[model samples]
Target: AAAPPLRDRLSFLHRLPILLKGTSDDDVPCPGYLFEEIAKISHESPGSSQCLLEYLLSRLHSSSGHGKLKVLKILLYLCSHGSSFFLLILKRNSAFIQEAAAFAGPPDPLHGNSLYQKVRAAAQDLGSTLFS
Candidate 1:
């Protein structure tokens, strides 16, 4: 089968939050349109995954306060639970990952206690599982 266009794949990713939010938590793990989009893009352009990882990292590093924090949280969640692609990015860019972690300093409470620990743990677990 032919691959979907890049725009369509990006659109699907853009709509992912709406689709996921509308569905129950139980339905999250099932293969959905977002997964299809990711797969199509990955298959069509192998470098797309790295591009996305970099884009997301850039978003996380933005200085826009809440927006940066929000994106960082979402990236953490997706990286930790979504797929092996997340870990692959981390392995390829360990220094970038460390820089990201450092940017998540104490001023950002989300990067503090339980939340930070959980996100860090998720990233670590994913890295170990996928790269080790």
Candidate 2:
């Protein structure tokens, strides 16, 4: 049996990628606003924060370079905002932090690729700030 009217908060996580799937760079909306919405939803309902963190982490593992950067940007915003709840969740999943910092392709050019470099920098800064 399913709950009626009151939809699952986790459902919101699925729509996240849609916001990022755009041809033009400007088409992507502000990710921090999305994080704010998630925080608002978590405030109103609860549990979705964990759902969001896990969903984003899983997507990080599966996403491509551009997609992964988008994910990291959202996370960087969340990490900067001092979301202790999500940060605590991150602390528990420290290995993922390491993986993110290593998000670079082989060889020097690919390693120096702007997308991968930004992703790695964001993750490195994120992990250092969080773990410190």
Weakest ten-residue segment in model 1 by summed lDDT? 21-30
Candidate 2 C-alpha error for residue 34, in Å: 2.9
- In model 2, where is the ten-residue run with the lowest total lDDT? 18-27
lDDT of 1 by residue, 6-118 (tens): 76467557645643432222212323444444344333343455555555566545533333344444444455455565556556766645554444346454443544554
Name model 2 segments beyond 4 Å from true: 1-32, 106-112
TM-score top scorer: 2
State how far residue 1 of model 1 sits from its true place (Å).
Answer: 27
Cα RMSDs, all models: 7.6, 5.0
lDDT of candidate 1 vs native? 0.47
As a whole number from 0 to 100, the lDDT of residue 25 in candidate 1 is: 28
Backbone clashes, each candidate:
0, 0
Q: Model 2: clashing residue pairs? A: none
